[PDB]
Ligand binder design. Structure first.
Ligand code: NA
Length: 181
């Protein structure tokens, strides 16, 4: 429908920790916006199965966060592997954005990309090499006019789809508050 090489691919992952060589992806969510940040479609929201030995690497922050959100129970019950999650996500993205055109979009999105390189390289390859990191704008705003940041807040639930929706909302806020284009 609104297929376009200008559309943007937004992605958020949840993991068992911060180290791609040690930890695993346990949730993924994608959203496609047009170039003006209008949400066109939401992609698969996938809890990825991991065995207890991998869940057992989680520190207290991860254990308490992902248990209280319900993610751990969804991971334990999930029948979807990383490979099947890649397949579902690519089948979605091919309907909205051509391969290799969209930067990877999100907050501190270089961290997610590291996990994609290690665990989902076929999906990493779908992105253009550039990054649209909303937290770049957050950090520049903090230094140039920090009072702006009091006008926006996040819930931060660490449910991947809700968090990437907050990333888009943050950029929409910056478009009006700190940009003049
Ligand atoms: Na994130």
């Amino acid at each position: 429908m609104s297929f376009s090489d200008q559309n943007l691919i937004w992605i958020d992952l949840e993991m068992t920790g911060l180290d791609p060589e040690m930890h695993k992806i346990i949730e993924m969510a994608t959203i496609v916006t047009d170039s003006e940040l209008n949400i066109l479609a939401e992609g698969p929201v996938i809890a990825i199965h991991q065995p207890e030995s991998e869940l057992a690497k989680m520190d207290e922050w991860c254990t308490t966060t992902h248990t209280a959100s319900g993610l751990v129970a969804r991971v334990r019950q999930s029948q979807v592997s990383e490979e099947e999650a890649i397949d579902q996500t690519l089948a979605f993205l091919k309907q909205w954005v051509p391969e290799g055109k969209s930067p990877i979009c999100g907050n501190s999105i270089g961290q997610d990309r590291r996990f994609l390189y290690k665990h989902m390289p076929r999906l990493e390859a779908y992105f253009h090499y550039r990054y649209i990191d909303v937290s770049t704008i957050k950090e520049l705003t903090r230094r140039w006019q920090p009072e702006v940041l009091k006008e926006f807040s996040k819930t931060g639930s660490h449910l991947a789809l809700d968090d990437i929706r907050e990333s888009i909302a943050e950029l929409q806020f910056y478009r009006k508050a700190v940009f003049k284009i």
